[PDB]
Nucleic acid binder design. Structure first.
Lengths: 123, 142, 187, 258
RNA sequence: UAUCUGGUUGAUCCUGCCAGUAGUCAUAUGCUUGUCUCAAAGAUUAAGCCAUGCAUGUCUAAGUAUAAGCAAUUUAUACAGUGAAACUGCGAAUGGCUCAUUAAAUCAGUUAUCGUUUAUUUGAUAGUUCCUUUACUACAUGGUAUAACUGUGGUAAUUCUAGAGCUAAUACAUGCUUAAAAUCUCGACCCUUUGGAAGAGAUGUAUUUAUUAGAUAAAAAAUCAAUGUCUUCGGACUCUUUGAUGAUUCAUAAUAACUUUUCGAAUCGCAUGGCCUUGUGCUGGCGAUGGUUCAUUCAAAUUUCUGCCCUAUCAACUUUCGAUGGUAGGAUAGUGGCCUACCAUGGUUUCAACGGGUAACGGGGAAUAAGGGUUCGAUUCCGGAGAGGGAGCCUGAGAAACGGCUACC
RNA sequence: GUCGGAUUUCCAACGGGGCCUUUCCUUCUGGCUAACCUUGAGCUUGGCGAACCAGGACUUUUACUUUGAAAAAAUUAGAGUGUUCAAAGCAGGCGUAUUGCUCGAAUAUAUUAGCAUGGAAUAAUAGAAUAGGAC
RNA sequence: ACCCACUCGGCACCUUACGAGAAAUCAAAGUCUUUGGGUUCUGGGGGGAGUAUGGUCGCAAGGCUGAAACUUAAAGGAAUU
RNA sequence: CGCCCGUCGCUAGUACCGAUUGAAUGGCUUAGUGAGGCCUCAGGAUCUGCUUAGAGAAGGGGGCAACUCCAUCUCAGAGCGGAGAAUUUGGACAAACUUGGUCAUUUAGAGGAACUAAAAGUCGUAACAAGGUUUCCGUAGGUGAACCUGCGGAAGGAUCAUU
RNA sequence: CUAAGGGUCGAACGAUCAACUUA
């Protein structure tokens, strides 16, 4: 009779699973960023869809809106904190212009490569 | 109606005693109460002779809670009439309303005069009968 | 036992209500008392939340009060002569609320003789002063005094015997006495 | 169900208790007492999760059995005693007296009062009646019965109970220009002044309480608690005094504090 | 992340369906299976049936002990330390499990109890109980068992029980013990008659009945039936008293009675202190238990408004023998056809009544998607029903209880 | 006018309130008498009551819409938070680290029905016609 | 009674296609993805089948309401060669 | 030399009808019988309190001679009472059984009449061209079979055309 | 035993009569 724990699925399978154009796109991304499962690409796209949906819902509200402002800066502050959005792009419109590569670059795997301690993403 | 005493028992206001050895004003004592909510007691309930222990102004019933309104569709019972209340239920699916009606049986007092096709307001009181749970407080007709 | 719910009865639309619950205890109902007269036998029935109720059977004597005079004297009962609801109660002489009993009324006559100093039909300054002071009020209606010459007045039990274990009431006087007298007299 | 219920699962407990949802499936159901279960605070949760003096359930029991706390003058020994609004817990050890006052956010507080302040408790009377033997009495919000009160005292006012002697020493009438304390509802914990009220003789009397920052809100008369006149509170107000800043102002306050 | 494709034709554009596609707190199964965290799990058919073992018993400083139980009192001659069993007081009606029944029923939001009960708590609350009330009676205090226990036993078996002998209570059944004043009733007497009265009874609370008060928007005069305060009896007359509610025959008070009679402490644990008329004299604390009434709280039970799946190859339903309403009475803790006696013939319905099916407990919610919506919801939370199918009942504040009994299949 | 924050008279716009133009959009007892014609030498005694209330009064009806109280939690969206990331959870953070101190534990949605509330568009609704019509 | 001009209601007709439709074609079959003037009825792949049964009307023949099991990946519409 | 229709015959499946006052299962229910708990009218085993109540006879105190006073092992006899089971009259609640009725769910059945699936069964050629009798719609009759014929209507015709 | 089914002479009213039935 204890309160049940909450679980959620963090990835979204593509509606079209069988397409050469998308298939090669994720293979290029996975190989460049060193990813084994394409569910990792499915996961990171799922997070992008959620924040885009939340940001889109904010953009249908007028300016000087307490709900739009508070959640708008909070989402913007989180994005600039994690490093996916530059300081001069904090205007709530570039948030909709974020891509998967920008989020993938912030992963610790790529940062280890960038600082020069692995010599290869697989390493 | 025609006769105040038309039953086997003697109809009287409970615990109201008229002393047979005095000649005080307004002969038989007629206890009356004010329902409230701006509902004035009709003069018939003040100078009348009916008892109607369930009357909202001369009986013992206390009126509290909802104060509904509706027209009169039937008057074939004794001291009790049926009212019809019309509302508009909203269906969330096809973005509009529909007409619906409910027949609420209410208790009426001999002081009031209600006919078929009369908008009346009824107040909630204690259960008077199996289906009757409202009392007429004010008839609205010219 | 006897149920007291509204789930075993037809609805206002004539529909037959289906069974929902077994007969609950907070809707229980016990049997009628049917109180007789003489040889007092009062039983007790345990009710909800304690509060014992005295079930009355065969009550011999009760309390009756003269509203006009304002007194209340113990008086023996001797049967009922009129009952509005049913007539078999009159035949069986069962004591229930709102029943026209025919009381002994002997103490009431004794009180009147000892209070206002007058006799119904049929030497001390302290007593005489009250008797003279209480004048102009020793005259009552003809019906009550006529029944006093009969040594019996009519009354009406105003206390529920089964629920309270006591049957109390008042002596009829006024329009009620005239009303009930006509029904008894009516041919 | 065939009688009363003595249990409280850890999902139907009042949300202002700030209880978790993983440490057990039950909640400390308060026993019958001065206040309702949904409008009070058990002694166990207050000492275990608020003051953090006790860790486990038995530690609260050991502390309570040792005759340390004193609620409204009485020592008390029940772990589920329903201490609610206007309840003062006095601790002989640690030299602290604690008063249960709602916060702006919607929960209880740990407001500390001086020993002089703990000697008196404010109480909102609920009923005034002429009891048996013709003696008048009043019924405060805590259920205390005080005989022979001031005739000027009527319904919906506040009295200053002496606690130690249980006698009324001061009464505050309900009128315009009175500082109150909202107890219960989505607007609970707000402190403001009364400007006017619409009587609405059908139930649920409403009063327009105005904050010191020109903010106005509507709260039913059953959820109000007059705590003094305009500008002078008869009780030491909690920190913040019910300003009720918005989510934007709160965030700037945090960023101005870190 | 507001997306389609393949298939009728020699070929084309359509309608149209099939199939493909992705997801499922929707399951089942197959193949394979290395790790960390979290975690569902005899619901679907059978609310089918159950071996066996458990699932509710319980004490303090403070109800009752001489265990013919255990240590030691050495502060205790009656125990007074610990303490099985038993009596007693409470709890066992919570929790847990299942979704069979049930389609204005349950249930959800929302009202009322001025129409009711309420253990346990919280805050208050019994100078009035000796009734020819002067010997009629212990009030520095009354009576009666009984369990455990000792011994006799019975039956194959049972949480089966008897006969004999004790003993206890916060066990049963009785029961008194503190002032002073105030009115109602009485009234022996003085009896001048403006009239005063020695002395006696009752007045707490609880149940029942009848009556009264429970109120009071604004200012001045003519008289009386008898002057009423004080008197120049020319009359100044003010002084006077009852709260709340939108609203009550409300709370409350006083009269006249009713009770076979409710309560008004014969209970218990610590520390033992003061006054002296120097005494088992008189006062005296911190508590526990219980108790009548009110309020409060945990509740319980009725109840105002709106809202539930598919069906007309269900169009009229209900009232024999309760249906609609009224009167009066029973019963209930209360309102009420809940029931009874009489009277009137009403009440519902195409605005979807009634009847039938439900792989129907309902809701909070779950899956699915731009929006709209569709489907599911036994299942952790809330409100309901049941203990195999029904009926009946004791105890208790609370059960129509089944890990309580009684009867039938 | 402070050093990419923030001011005074502003060209401008935008929602609100009040007043007048034939446009009462209820007033009686009251006390505040209010804005007091009240004026004492310039901080002064006496204007029409809701702008503060207690009460009588006609308060013709809605459908609709704005706002507020109300919609138990869990759940959903979602603020903050190094479960090491994450599913989660509501924890945590900071010292002179021997005395300790302290921000949190939000917010939002929640059908229909019920309650109050400002408005008057939209859609109906009754008023005074062999005048039983209003001051 | 005819000629000319105008007007209202008609049975309709000729030419174009703004516009609609899959096209044949349409002064509506137009003012429908720039989707909303008011209202009624009917249809959800082709067979089984307007069959079986149950109601209802009729002297009968027959009319109204009206399925399911089962089977199939096609039938069907307009045009081109 | 395309497509296609029906009767009849063989094989299988599905559904309908069907005499058998069919069968089985479950719900509802008239009536009869009616357990049991409960409430009432009685009942009285049994236990126990109180009031006298005389005697078989000891004991002590008093006239000390007969005689007198109360306690005792003992037994009748009379009432004043309290608790009080088995049993019992009546009443309401009402399990269950029997007998029927009704509703709903499956199922046997000679035979009758259909539909569907059936590589190359028989007979005829009804429809698609003016399909060789233009088709189709209704109605009635007839015929192994498609189908034919009578009456009325339609073009979905083979005629947008006779001032 | 109760209730119900009439004539009748003069707010509906007081007298008078006999009759077979039903619940």
């Amino acid at each position: 009779p204890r309160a049940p724990r909450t679980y959620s699925k963090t990835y979204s399978t593509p509606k079209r699973p069988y397409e050469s154009s998308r298939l090669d796109a994720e293979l290029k991304l996975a190989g460049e960023f060193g990813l084994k499962n394409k569910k990792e690409i499915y996961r990171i796209s799922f997070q992008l869809s959620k924040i885009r949906r939340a940001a889109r819902d904010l953009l249908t509200r007028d300016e000087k809106d307490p709900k739009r402002l508070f959640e708008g800066n909070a989402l913007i502050r989180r994005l600039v904190r994690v490093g996916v959005l530059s300081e001069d792009k904090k205007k709530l419109d570039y948030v909709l212009a974020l891509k998967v590569e920008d989020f993938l670059e912030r992963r610790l795997q790529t940062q280890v490569y960038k600082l020069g301690l692995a010599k290869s993403v697989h390493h | 109606e025609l006769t105040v005493q038309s039953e086997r028992a003697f109809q009287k206001q409970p615990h109201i005693f008229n002393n047979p050895k005095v000649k005080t004003s307004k002969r038989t004592k007629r206890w009356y109460k004010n329902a409230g909510l701006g509902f004035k007691t009709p003069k018939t309930a003040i100078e009348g002779s009916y008892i109607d222990k369930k009357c909202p102004f001369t009986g013992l019933v206390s009126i509290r809670g909802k104060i509904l309104t509706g027209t009169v569709v039937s008057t074939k019972m004794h001291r009790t009439i049926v009212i019809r209340r019309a509302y508009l239920h909203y269906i969330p699916k096809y973005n509009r309303y529909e007409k619906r009606h409910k027949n609420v049986p209410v208790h009426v007092s001999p002081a009031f005069r209600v006919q078929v096709g009369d908008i009346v307001t009824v107040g909630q009181c204690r259960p008077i009968s199996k289906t009757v749970r409202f009392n007429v407080v004010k008839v609205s007709a010219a | 036992g006897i149920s007291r719910d509204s789930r075993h009865k037809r609805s206002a639309t004539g529909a037959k209500r289906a069974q929902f619950r077994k007969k609950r205890k907070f809707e229980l109902g016990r049997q009628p008392a049917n109180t007789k007269i003489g040889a007092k036998r009062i039983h007790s029935v345990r009710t909800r939340g304690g509060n014992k109720k005295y079930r009355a059977l065969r009550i011999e004597t009760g309390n009756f009060s003269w509203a006009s005079e304002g007194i209340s004297k113990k008086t023996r009962i001797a049967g009922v002569v009129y009952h509005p609801s049913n007539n078999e109660l009159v035949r069986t002489n069962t004591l229930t609320k709102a029943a026209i009993v025919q009381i002994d009324a002997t103490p009431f006559r004794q009180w009147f003789e000892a209070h206002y100093g007058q006799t119904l039909g049929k030497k001390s300054k302290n007593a005489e002063r009250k008797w003279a002071a209480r004048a102009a009020s020793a005259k009552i209606e003809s019906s009550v005094e006529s029944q006093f010459s009969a040594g019996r007045l009519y009354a009406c039990i105003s206390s529920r015997p089964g629920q309270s274990g006591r049957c109390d009431g008042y002596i009829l006087e006024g329009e009620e006495l005239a009303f009930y007298l006509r029904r008894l007299t009516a041919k | 169900a065939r009688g009363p219920k003595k249990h409280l699962k850890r999902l139907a407990a009042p949300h202002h208790w700030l209880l978790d949802k993983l440490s057990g499936c039950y909640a400390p159901r308060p026993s019958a007492g001065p206040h309702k279960l949904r409008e009070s605070l058990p002694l166990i949760v207050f000492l275990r999760n608020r003051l953090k003096y006790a860790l486990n359930g038995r530690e609260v029991k050991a502390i309570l059995m040792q005759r340390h706390v004193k609620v409204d003058g009485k020592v008390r020994t029940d772990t589920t005693y329903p201490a609610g609004f206007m309840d003062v817990i006095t601790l002989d050890a640690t030299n602290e007296n604690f008063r249960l006052v709602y916060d702006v956010k919607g929960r209880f507080a740990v407001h500390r009062i001086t020993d002089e302040e703990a000697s008196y408790k404010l109480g909102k009377v609920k009923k005034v009646q002429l009891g048996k033997k013709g003696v008048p009495y009043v019924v405060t919000h805590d259920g205390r019965t005080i005989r022979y009160p001031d005739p000027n005292i009527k319904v919906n006012d506040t009295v200053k109970i002496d606690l130690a002697s249980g006698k009324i020493t001061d009464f505050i009438k309900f009128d315009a220009g009175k500082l109150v304390y909202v107890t219960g509802g989505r607007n609970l914990g707000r402190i403001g002044t009364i400007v006017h009220k619409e009587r609405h003789d059908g139930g649920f009397d409403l009063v327009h309480i105005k904050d010191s920052l020109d903010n106005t809100f509507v709260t039913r008369l059953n959820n109000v608690f007059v705590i003094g006149e305009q500008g002078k509170p008869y009780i030491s107000l909690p920190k913040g005094k019910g300003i009720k800043l918005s989510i934007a102002e709160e965030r700037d306050r945090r960023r101005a504090q870190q």
